[PDB]
RNA sequence: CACAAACGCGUCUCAGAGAUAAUUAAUGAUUUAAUCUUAACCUAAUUAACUCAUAAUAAAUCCAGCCCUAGAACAGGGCACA
């Protein structure tokens, strides 16, 4: 019984992943030249909890969504309380989303690698490499 | 219909009694504009 | 004045309409009082103690008069 | 144009103008005599 | 002059958890840290945050005791 | 030597607070203090600041009559200006001498 | 009054002018000897920029102002009438005598600012980046100074430049 | 008045609500009284040591009235603290970007520079419009009156008014408006 | 480059809207002509700043011990299947 589905509009913005960095290949096109590519692998990624539009931003929704599994023993109270009311494993990371009023998708509801399609451009935010003082 | 006390307070509950309050000492001739005690010689 | 009525004078009300009667209590001096002046650099300081004499009074009643014109 | 003090007609057909909150001489016939109020 | 609105709480003082085992009077507290406690109650009572946090030992001492009262 | 000077102060300072308090009970009546003082003055009641303050906020009512005495006066001063100048005193306006 | 008309009937073009009947000056003014229409009904020195139904009697049907020749007001009275009706134009009075515009009425912009007593006009100020300090202030004019004559029932002089 | 002790002073020592319209009124004829309040210069009870203060509700502050060309030479500036943080910002721009800034500013710097003026601008709401809360209508008391009179414009005056007054000059019948 | 890393000489990425100064043009009155207007209404072409859309940050209250591409200390991320 997932949320309705509305057709695509201008303007509208999807959701992103929370996916871990592999490491570079290289790789070369048709031209000849040479490019090196980043391996980003998504591991689990699941939609964890959905904000009103007037609750967070008063403009666009936000779709929060967790990182990989990690073990059960080594969180806090509360956050293993949020997990077992949804019914998933705790999540390493938690990023929050701006998402479109038509592009709102149900809590609990699994993303895969292929909601990216080739061709298209993406945008990276992680922490740096701390190289201390 | 006519006003024969009345007291302020923190909430309505507090102010109400306090509204009695007044009203007893008007009725009972004890204010505090009251003639005050005569200490004349007799 | 009283709570219904209040009289003004023109400055001041006749000895008729008006009496006030007060008791003297207390006669004492007041707390050590003290008055210093001081000029920097020029070794000036003077410092004095005053004691001012007081009187304490009470008023016992305030009678109006039914004399009115 | 050319900021001046003073205002002058060069020649008679310069009109003044108050545009901007400041006058103009403006030339129709020679665009040299545009003159500017400082 | 307006009525008196006496049942204004009506509900709220007087609530009936259940009609088969005794009312409870649980306060549900959070104890917020130092931090959300202050402004709390600078929202509450219409004040800024500084006067909420307490003072040193030195102020704290040379309070009089006994303040002269009057009336 | 501060507590000199603030000694001297004293007697400003309060003198100071009492003109607010006069201030905000002869406005809470619409009338300025500049127009409640001198047009008292002129009904020849001599009362000081101190007492004014007293009365502003002990004697709500008694305050009232001096602000609506002060009032009346002025009304008749600008009624004289206004006319002739051969007006006979106002019935509250006119100067009792004693001698 | 008068009206130009101007019609098309088949490559043929008619202009004719036709009379609107015109109201006339009230009958008794309190002062019939003056010469000028300002001082002849005692307004002299009495009128400010919101007096609308004053200025509303000296201004064309598109806001623009009637020459002095036909008014015969003076020209001392002239100038101040003028600056009058400038500053009703800005203050936000007067708004049935703007030109009618129904191209330039839908596109709406930024709200309007309500002001008054505005001496110069909105495009030709400069903001004051430095003020200065007291003995050399750069003062924000208020009002014009060929009201400065008017009457005052207070009596303080008005204050001009603020 | 035959009070208790307790009741007494704390009548004596209310918090009042006041509502101030903004329609059309200036900023600082709007701050002149609006800071006599949040002092509490009103009371005959006031003490700069007293915690006496009245909460002053201001609505409709998007159209309060520059007088003069106050909306384009008067100039809000401040700076940032780091190099080159200057911002000298217009009354009009910044009107347009925070509609309550203007009337917020004027009566900062009305109220004495103590330590108090924090505490007694709490105590200050503002509101660009008539959009109230409930809560904050339910607290007011009296609305204060305008302290400058709105003008009324030409379509505002009744036809009865238009016939009063006199016709000033009689224009000749042949000239085109 | 004699550490599982660091590093350049190597590789990658880098942006929309509003807004203006001088100046240019339309409509038009004081001055029934004309005239960009510290005359009104509407409207046009137009420096850089600047402002903002937008993006980043987001869970109150396991934490002894060990590990860490986290780190001066203190903090922070892992320790279920590894
Ligand atoms: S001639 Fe008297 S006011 Fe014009
Ligand atoms: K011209
Ligand atoms: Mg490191
Ligand atoms: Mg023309
Ligand atoms: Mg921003
Ligand atoms: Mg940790
Ligand atoms: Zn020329």
Redesign the pocket.
């Known amino acids: 019984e997932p949320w309705p589905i509305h057709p695509w509009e201008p303007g509208s913005?999807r959701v992103g992943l929370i996916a871990l960095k592999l490491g570079m290949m290289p790789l070369w096109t048709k031209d000849g030249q040479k490019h090196?590519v980043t391996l980003l692998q998504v591991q689990d990624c699941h939609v964890l909890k959905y904000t009103p539009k007037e609750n967070h931003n008063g403009?666009?929704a936000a779709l929060t969504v967790?990182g990989k599994?990690?073990?059960h023993?080594?969180?806090?109270?509360?956050?293993l309380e949020?997990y077992q009311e949804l019914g998933l494993?705790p999540?390493?990371?938690?990023?929050?989303?701006?998402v479109t009023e038509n592009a709102v998708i149900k809590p609990g509801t699994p993303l895969y690698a292929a909601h990216f399609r080739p061709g298209q451009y993406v945008?990276v935010?992680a922490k740096t490499?701390?190289?201390?003082? | 219909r006519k006003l024969i006390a009345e007291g302020p307070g923190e909430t309505v509950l507090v102010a109400e009694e306090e509204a009695a309050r007044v009203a007893l000492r008007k009725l009972f001739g004890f204010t505090e504009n009251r003639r005050p005690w005569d200490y004349s010689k007799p | 004045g009283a709570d219904n009525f209040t009289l003004l004078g023109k400055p001041l009300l006749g000895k008729e309409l008006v009496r006030v009667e007060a008791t003297v209590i207390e006669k004492t001096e007041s707390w050590p009082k003290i008055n210093m002046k001081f000029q920097k650099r020029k070794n000036y300081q003077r410092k004095r103690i005053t004691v001012n004499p007081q009187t304490v009074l009470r008023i016992n009643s305030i009678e109006i008069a039914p004399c009115l014109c | 144009?050319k900021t001046k003090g003073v205002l002058k007609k060069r020649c008679r057909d310069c009109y003044l103008?108050?545009?901007?909150?400041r006058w103009?001489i403006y030339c129709k016939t020679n665009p040299k005599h545009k003159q500017?109020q400082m | 002059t307006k009525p008196i609105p006496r049942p204004d709480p009506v509900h709220n003082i007087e609530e009936t958890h259940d009609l088969v085992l005794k009312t409870r009077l649980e306060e549900k507290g959070?104890?917020?840290?130092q931090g959300p406690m202050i402004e709390q109650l600078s929202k509450m009572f219409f004040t800024t945050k500084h006067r909420w946090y307490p003072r040193g030992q030195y102020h704290r001492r040379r309070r009089k005791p006994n303040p002269p009262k009057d009336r | 030597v501060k507590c000199t000077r603030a000694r001297r102060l004293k007697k400003r300072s309060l003198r100071t607070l009492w003109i607010n308090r006069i201030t905000a009970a002869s406005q809470e009546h619409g009338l300025k203090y500049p127009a409640f003082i001198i047009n008292l003055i002129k009904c020849q009641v001599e009362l000081n600041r101190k007492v004014l303050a007293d009365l502003a906020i002990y004697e709500p009512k008694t305050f009232k009559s001096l602000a609506a005495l002060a009032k009346r006066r002025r009304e008749e001063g600008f009624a004289a200006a206004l006319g002739d100048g051969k007006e006979p005193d106002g019935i509250f306006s006119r100067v009792v001498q004693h001698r | 009054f008068?009206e130009v008309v101007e019609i098309l009937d088949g490559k043929t073009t008619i202009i004719e002018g036709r009379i609107t009947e015109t109201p006339q000056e009230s009958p008794n003014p309190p002062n019939p000897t003056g010469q000028c229409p300002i001082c002849r009904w005692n307004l002299k020195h009495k009128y400010n920029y919101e007096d609308v139904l004053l200025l509303s009697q000296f201004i064309?049907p598109?806001?623009?102002?009637?020459?002095?020749?036909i008014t015969g007001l003076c020209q001392e009275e002239?100038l101040k009438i003028?600056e009058c009706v400038?500053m009703a134009?800005?203050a936000g009075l007067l708004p049935n005598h703007?030109?009618k515009?129904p191209?330039?009425?839908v596109?709406k912009?930024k709200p309007r600012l309500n002001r008054y007593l505005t001496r110069?006009?909105?495009?030709?100020?400069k903001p004051i980046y430095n003020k200065g300090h007291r003995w050399n202030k750069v003062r924000m004019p208020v009002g014009s100074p060929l009201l400065k004559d008017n009457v005052s029932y207070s009596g303080r002089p008005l204050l001009l430049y603020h | 008045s035959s009070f208790s002790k307790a009741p007494q002073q704390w009548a004596t020592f209310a918090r009042v609500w006041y509502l101030l319209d903004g329609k059309m009124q200036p900023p600082g004829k709007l701050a002149a009284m609006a800071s006599v309040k949040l002092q509490g210069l009103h009371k005959p009870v006031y003490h700069q040591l007293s915690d006496c203060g009245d909460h002053v509700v201001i609505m409709n502050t998007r159209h309060i009235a520059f007088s003069g060309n106050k909306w384009e030479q008067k100039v809000y500036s401040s700076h940032t603290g780091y190099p080159g943080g200057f911002?000298q910002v217009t009354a009009a721009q910044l009107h347009q970007?925070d509609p309550v800034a203007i009337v917020k500013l004027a009566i900062y710097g009305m109220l004495p520079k103590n330590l108090h003026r924090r505490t007694m601008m709490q105590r200050l709401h503002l509101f660009p419009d008539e959009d109230i809360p409930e809560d904050i209508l339910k607290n007011l008391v009296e609305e204060l009156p305008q302290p400058r009179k709105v003008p009324r414009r030409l379509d505002e005056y009744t036809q009865e008014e238009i016939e009063a007054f006199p016709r000033v000059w009689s224009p000749p019948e042949?000239?085109?408006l």
């Open positions: 913005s090196v403009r666009m967790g599994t990690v073990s023993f080594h969180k806090s109270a509360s956050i949020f494993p999540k390493q990371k938690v990023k929050i989303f701006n945008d935010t490499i701390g190289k201390g003082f | 144009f103008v108050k545009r901007r909150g103009f500017r | 959070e104890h917020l840290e | 008068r064309r598109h806001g623009g102002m009637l020459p002095r020749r002239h003028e400038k134009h800005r703007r030109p515009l191209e330039g009425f596109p912009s110069w006009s909105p495009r030709s100020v | 911002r970007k042949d000239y085109r």
